[PDB]
Design a protein around this motif. Structure first.
Motif, PDB file in Angstrom:
ATOM      1  N   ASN A 180     -51.947  -2.608  32.296  1.00  0.00           N
ATOM      2  CA  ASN A 180     -52.914  -3.615  32.767  1.00  0.00           C
ATOM      3  C   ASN A 180     -54.216  -3.601  31.937  1.00  0.00           C
ATOM      4  OD1 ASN A 180     -54.074  -5.652  34.330  1.00  0.00           O
ATOM      5  ND2 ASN A 180     -54.446  -4.345  36.111  1.00  0.00           N
TER       6      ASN A 180
ATOM      7  N   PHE B   2     -43.208 -17.198  20.593  1.00  0.00           N
ATOM      8  CA  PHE B   2     -41.801 -16.897  20.832  1.00  0.00           C
ATOM      9  C   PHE B   2     -41.022 -17.883  19.955  1.00  0.00           C
ATOM     10  CE2 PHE B   2     -42.379 -15.490  25.595  1.00  0.00           C
ATOM     11  CZ  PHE B   2     -42.993 -14.321  25.190  1.00  0.00           C
TER      12      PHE B   2
ATOM     13  N   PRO C 265     -36.906 -15.461  28.415  1.00  0.00           N
ATOM     14  CA  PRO C 265     -37.844 -14.353  28.271  1.00  0.00           C
ATOM     15  C   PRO C 265     -38.050 -13.640  29.604  1.00  0.00           C
ATOM     16  CG  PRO C 265     -38.794 -16.434  27.493  1.00  0.00           C
ATOM     17  CD  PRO C 265     -37.582 -16.757  28.299  1.00  0.00           C
TER      18      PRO C 265
ATOM     19  N   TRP D  83     -40.595 -10.716  31.378  1.00  0.00           N
ATOM     20  CA  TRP D  83     -41.798  -9.877  31.400  1.00  0.00           C
ATOM     21  C   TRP D  83     -41.599  -8.774  32.425  1.00  0.00           C
ATOM     22  CZ3 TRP D  83     -46.138 -10.096  35.270  1.00  0.00           C
ATOM     23  CH2 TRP D  83     -47.200  -9.252  34.904  1.00  0.00           C
TER      24      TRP D  83
ATOM     25  N   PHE E 169     -46.315  -4.995  36.483  1.00  0.00           N
ATOM     26  CA  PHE E 169     -47.027  -3.715  36.583  1.00  0.00           C
ATOM     27  C   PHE E 169     -46.300  -2.656  37.421  1.00  0.00           C
ATOM     28  CE2 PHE E 169     -50.420  -6.992  35.970  1.00  0.00           C
ATOM     29  CZ  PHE E 169     -50.585  -6.730  34.610  1.00  0.00           C
TER      30      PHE E 169
ATOM     31  N   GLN F  28     -39.672 -10.080  35.577  1.00  0.00           N
ATOM     32  CA  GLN F  28     -40.052 -11.448  35.949  1.00  0.00           C
ATOM     33  C   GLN F  28     -39.552 -12.445  34.899  1.00  0.00           C
ATOM     34  OE1 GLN F  28     -43.821 -12.115  37.818  1.00  0.00           O
ATOM     35  NE2 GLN F  28     -44.314 -13.851  36.482  1.00  0.00           N
TER      36      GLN F  28
ATOM     37  N   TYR G 113     -39.180 -16.041  32.880  1.00  0.00           N
ATOM     38  CA  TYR G 113     -40.107 -17.094  32.430  1.00  0.00           C
ATOM     39  C   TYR G 113     -39.289 -18.308  31.981  1.00  0.00           C
ATOM     40  CZ  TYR G 113     -44.652 -14.807  32.887  1.00  0.00           C
ATOM     41  OH  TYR G 113     -45.781 -14.212  33.428  1.00  0.00           O
ATOM     42  N   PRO G 114     -39.937 -19.476  31.735  1.00  0.00           N
ATOM     43  CA  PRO G 114     -39.153 -20.665  31.357  1.00  0.00           C
ATOM     44  C   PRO G 114     -38.301 -20.453  30.092  1.00  0.00           C
ATOM     45  CG  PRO G 114     -41.399 -21.311  31.987  1.00  0.00           C
ATOM     46  CD  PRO G 114     -41.359 -19.799  31.956  1.00  0.00           C
TER      47      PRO G 114
ATOM     48  N   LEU H  95     -36.018 -21.158  26.481  1.00  0.00           N
ATOM     49  CA  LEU H  95     -36.182 -21.806  25.158  1.00  0.00           C
ATOM     50  C   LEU H  95     -34.838 -22.304  24.607  1.00  0.00           C
ATOM     51  CD1 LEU H  95     -38.332 -19.096  25.049  1.00  0.00           C
ATOM     52  CD2 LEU H  95     -38.819 -20.176  22.883  1.00  0.00           C
TER      53      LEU H  95
ATOM     54  N   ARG I  45     -42.345 -21.614  21.187  1.00  0.00           N
ATOM     55  CA  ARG I  45     -43.424 -21.854  22.156  1.00  0.00           C
ATOM     56  C   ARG I  45     -44.606 -20.945  21.854  1.00  0.00           C
ATOM     57  NH1 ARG I  45     -40.327 -25.361  23.357  1.00  0.00           N
ATOM     58  NH2 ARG I  45     -39.110 -25.699  25.270  1.00  0.00           N
TER      59      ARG I  45
ATOM     60  N   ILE J  90     -47.580 -18.974  23.442  1.00  0.00           N
ATOM     61  CA  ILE J  90     -47.854 -18.482  24.796  1.00  0.00           C
ATOM     62  C   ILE J  90     -48.977 -17.465  24.827  1.00  0.00           C
ATOM     63  CG2 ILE J  90     -45.437 -18.888  25.431  1.00  0.00           C
ATOM     64  CD1 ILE J  90     -46.591 -15.298  25.386  1.00  0.00           C
ATOM     65  N   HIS J  91     -49.600 -17.341  25.999  1.00  0.00           N
ATOM     66  CA  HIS J  91     -50.684 -16.382  26.227  1.00  0.00           C
ATOM     67  C   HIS J  91     -50.177 -15.144  26.976  1.00  0.00           C
ATOM     68  CE1 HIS J  91     -53.724 -19.183  24.779  1.00  0.00           C
ATOM     69  NE2 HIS J  91     -53.102 -20.125  25.463  1.00  0.00           N
ATOM     70  N   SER J  92     -50.253 -13.985  26.332  1.00  0.00           N
ATOM     71  CA  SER J  92     -49.913 -12.711  26.954  1.00  0.00           C
ATOM     72  C   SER J  92     -51.073 -11.737  26.763  1.00  0.00           C
ATOM     73  CB  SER J  92     -48.608 -12.149  26.378  1.00  0.00           C
ATOM     74  OG  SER J  92     -48.127 -11.063  27.159  1.00  0.00           O
ATOM     75  N   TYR J  93     -50.807 -10.433  26.860  1.00  0.00           N
ATOM     76  CA  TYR J  93     -51.861  -9.413  26.792  1.00  0.00           C
ATOM     77  C   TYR J  93     -51.404  -8.160  26.037  1.00  0.00           C
ATOM     78  CZ  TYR J  93     -54.105 -12.382  30.257  1.00  0.00           C
ATOM     79  OH  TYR J  93     -54.645 -13.448  30.925  1.00  0.00           O
TER      80      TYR J  93
ATOM     81  N   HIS K 234     -48.523  -5.411  27.125  1.00  0.00           N
ATOM     82  CA  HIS K 234     -47.518  -5.978  28.026  1.00  0.00           C
ATOM     83  C   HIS K 234     -46.127  -5.861  27.396  1.00  0.00           C
ATOM     84  CE1 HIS K 234     -50.178  -8.439  31.015  1.00  0.00           C
ATOM     85  NE2 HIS K 234     -50.672  -7.239  30.772  1.00  0.00           N
TER      86      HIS K 234
ATOM     87  N   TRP L  19     -41.976  -7.109  27.038  1.00  0.00           N
ATOM     88  CA  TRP L  19     -41.069  -8.262  27.076  1.00  0.00           C
ATOM     89  C   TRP L  19     -39.687  -7.914  26.491  1.00  0.00           C
ATOM     90  CZ3 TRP L  19     -42.527 -13.147  28.883  1.00  0.00           C
ATOM     91  CH2 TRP L  19     -43.902 -13.395  29.013  1.00  0.00           C
TER      92      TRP L  19
HETATM   93  C1  LIG Z   1     -44.108 -21.922  28.470  1.00  0.00           C
HETATM   94  C2  LIG Z   1     -43.253 -20.652  28.299  1.00  0.00           C
HETATM   95  N1  LIG Z   1     -42.005 -20.764  27.794  1.00  0.00           N
HETATM   96  C3  LIG Z   1     -41.326 -19.621  27.691  1.00  0.00           C
HETATM   97  S1  LIG Z   1     -42.299 -18.407  28.241  1.00  0.00           S
HETATM   98  C4  LIG Z   1     -43.630 -19.400  28.648  1.00  0.00           C
HETATM   99  C5  LIG Z   1     -44.816 -19.003  29.186  1.00  0.00           C
HETATM  100  C6  LIG Z   1     -45.488 -19.749  30.172  1.00  0.00           C
HETATM  101  C7  LIG Z   1     -46.716 -19.326  30.712  1.00  0.00           C
HETATM  102  C8  LIG Z   1     -47.337 -18.150  30.308  1.00  0.00           C
HETATM  103  C9  LIG Z   1     -48.608 -17.756  30.891  1.00  0.00           C
HETATM  104  N2  LIG Z   1     -48.924 -16.331  30.636  1.00  0.00           N
HETATM  105  C10 LIG Z   1     -48.586 -15.328  31.465  1.00  0.00           C
HETATM  106  O1  LIG Z   1     -48.002 -15.531  32.519  1.00  0.00           O
HETATM  107  C11 LIG Z   1     -48.882 -14.002  31.035  1.00  0.00           C
HETATM  108  C12 LIG Z   1     -47.623 -13.409  30.359  1.00  0.00           C
HETATM  109  C13 LIG Z   1     -47.598 -11.943  30.745  1.00  0.00           C
HETATM  110  O2  LIG Z   1     -48.441 -11.179  29.851  1.00  0.00           O
HETATM  111  C14 LIG Z   1     -48.150 -11.948  32.167  1.00  0.00           C
HETATM  112  N3  LIG Z   1     -49.165 -13.052  32.177  1.00  0.00           N
HETATM  113  C15 LIG Z   1     -50.206 -13.267  33.021  1.00  0.00           C
HETATM  114  O3  LIG Z   1     -50.994 -14.181  32.853  1.00  0.00           O
HETATM  115  C16 LIG Z   1     -50.415 -12.275  34.200  1.00  0.00           C
HETATM  116  N4  LIG Z   1     -51.810 -11.816  34.140  1.00  0.00           N
HETATM  117  C17 LIG Z   1     -52.472 -10.725  33.763  1.00  0.00           C
HETATM  118  O4  LIG Z   1     -51.887  -9.707  33.392  1.00  0.00           O
HETATM  119  C18 LIG Z   1     -53.996 -10.727  33.901  1.00  0.00           C
HETATM  120  C19 LIG Z   1     -54.502  -9.423  34.535  1.00  0.00           C
HETATM  121  O5  LIG Z   1     -55.028  -9.008  33.253  1.00  0.00           O
HETATM  122  C20 LIG Z   1     -54.645 -10.259  32.644  1.00  0.00           C
HETATM  123  C21 LIG Z   1     -50.061 -12.808  35.614  1.00  0.00           C
HETATM  124  C22 LIG Z   1     -48.607 -13.311  35.631  1.00  0.00           C
HETATM  125  C23 LIG Z   1     -50.183 -11.621  36.581  1.00  0.00           C
HETATM  126  C24 LIG Z   1     -50.987 -13.945  36.062  1.00  0.00           C
HETATM  127  C25 LIG Z   1     -46.668 -17.402  29.334  1.00  0.00           C
HETATM  128  C26 LIG Z   1     -45.436 -17.822  28.783  1.00  0.00           C
END
Ligand SMILES: Cc1ncsc1-c1ccc(CNC(=O)[C@@H]2C[C@@H](O)CN2C(=O)[C@@H](NC(=O)C2COC2)C(C)(C)C)cc1
Lengths: 87, 104, 141
Positions: free
Chosen positions: C6, C15, C25, C27, C30, C35, C37-38, C40, C46, C48-51, C54, C56
């Motif tokens: 975290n 991706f 995909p 994830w 914690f 989990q 995800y959508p 491909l 795509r 995408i926003h991750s951290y 994390h 995968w």
């Molecule tokens: C559009 C798409 N197609 C295939 S995958 C995908 C996609 C769609 C949306 C996202 C938005 N990003 C997330 O959900 C990220 C990915 C993973 O690192 C977890 N995550 C978060 O935002 C997560 N947030 C956090 O860890 C926050 C706490 O410190 C940052 C939560 C799911 C708990 C909200 C990422 C990828």
């Protein structure tokens, strides 16, 4: 270059690199330069040989990897050969 | 670029590769090292066409994207017995059985 | 054991599906729960926003067959240098011939009928024991 001969049940003689054939631990034990396969017909053993080529070519490459093609009609017999040959 | 081949005669099939820029004659030297017959006792074919010694494999239609590791291209082979050449004969592989009912 | 850290530090990722499969995909959250995800489609990408920190992994969306990402099992986003995204190249593994035959046979025979096939009992078990993420999370421990 060192080759070996793999003979199908219907008498087809497939000549392949020794290194390729050693993909199979079973074939290694059968050699230690010709091996006869009484239960593997040619439409199957030909595909086995093609797998060796594919595997040797694409193992440890970052160039995109294509799917290994297997027709529905040969899938069951090929599975049985792969299980016997451990490959 | 590598091309991936099956060199076939009667019930014999050789799996090997060669360069697209290499010649028909150089492929006969490969067959010579394996089956112990010299180039002048070999004829090589693409389908029904007799291949000329000085041509490259690429010029004769064996290219890297049509002669693939998992689906290699076929080169026919015929030997000369005594004075004259045999006809091209390639024995077909066996036929798969019928699909079991559960696979239909 | 296997769970995302975290960190709260953003990491932008591409991706890139360089396989002929539809890609799911996954994830690891914690608590280590997978989990999804959508998906491909083959050959698509795509942004995408991750951290950072994390975790995968990537599967065939229809069969759960295993796929590689940058040549390995798990992908961990790292620090973006020069504001540039990290590439996650998703590819087919070189499957063993046995596993590839199992995939093809599974795609043609309904699970109820595996027992009607004329094969040794051990191959019936191999068919029934189909790919699954939980099994692999246990293995990677
Ligand atoms: C559009 C798409 N197609 C295939 S995958 C995908 C996609 C769609 C949306 C996202 C938005 N990003 C997330 O959900 C990220 C990915 C993973 O690192 C977890 N995550 C978060 O935002 C997560 N947030 C956090 O860890 C926050 C706490 O410190 C940052 C939560 C799911 C708990 C909200 C990422 C990828």
């Amino acid at each position: 270059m060192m080759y070996v001969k793999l003979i199908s049940s219907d008498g087809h003689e497939f000549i392949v690199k020794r290194e390729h054939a050693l993909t199979s631990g079973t074939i290694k034990a059968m050699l230690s330069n010709e091996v006869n396969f009484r239960e593997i017909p040619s439409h199957v053993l030909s595909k086995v040989c093609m797998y060796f080529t594919y595997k040797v070519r694409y193992t440890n490459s970052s160039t995109e990897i294509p799917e290994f093609p297997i027709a529905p009609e040969i899938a069951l017999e090929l599975l049985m050969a792969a299980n016997f040959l451990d490959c | 670029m590598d091309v991936f081949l099956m060199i076939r005669r009667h019930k014999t099939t050789i799996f090997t590769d060669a360069k697209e820029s290499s010649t028909v004659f150089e492929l006969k030297r490969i067959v010579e090292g394996i089956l112990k017959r010299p180039p002048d006792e070999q004829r090589l074919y693409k389908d029904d066409q007799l291949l000329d010694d000085g041509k490259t494999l690429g010029e004769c239609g064996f290219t890297s994207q049509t002669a693939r590791p998992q689906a290699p291209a076929t080169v026919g082979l015929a030997f000369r017995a005594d004075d004259t050449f045999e006809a091209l004969c390639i024995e077909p592989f066996s036929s798969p059985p019928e699909l079991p009912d559960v696979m239909k | 054991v296997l769970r995302s850290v975290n960190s709260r530090e953003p990491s932008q990722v591409i991706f890139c599906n360089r396989s002929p499969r539809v890609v799911l995909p996954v994830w690891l959250n914690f608590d280590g729960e997978p989990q999804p995800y959508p998906t491909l489609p083959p050959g698509t990408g795509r942004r995408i926003h991750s951290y950072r920190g994390h975790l995968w992994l990537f599967r065939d969306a229809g069969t759960h067959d295993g796929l590689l990402v940058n040549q390995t099992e798990l992908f961990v986003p790292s620090l973006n240098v020069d504001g540039q995204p990290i590439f996650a190249n998703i590819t087919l593994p070189v499957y063993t011939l046995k596993e590839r035959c199992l995939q093809v046979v599974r795609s043609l025979v309904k699970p109820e009928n595996y027992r009607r096939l004329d094969i040794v009992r051990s191959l019936y078990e191999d068919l029934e024991d189909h790919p699954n993420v939980q099994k692999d999370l246990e293995r990677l421990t």
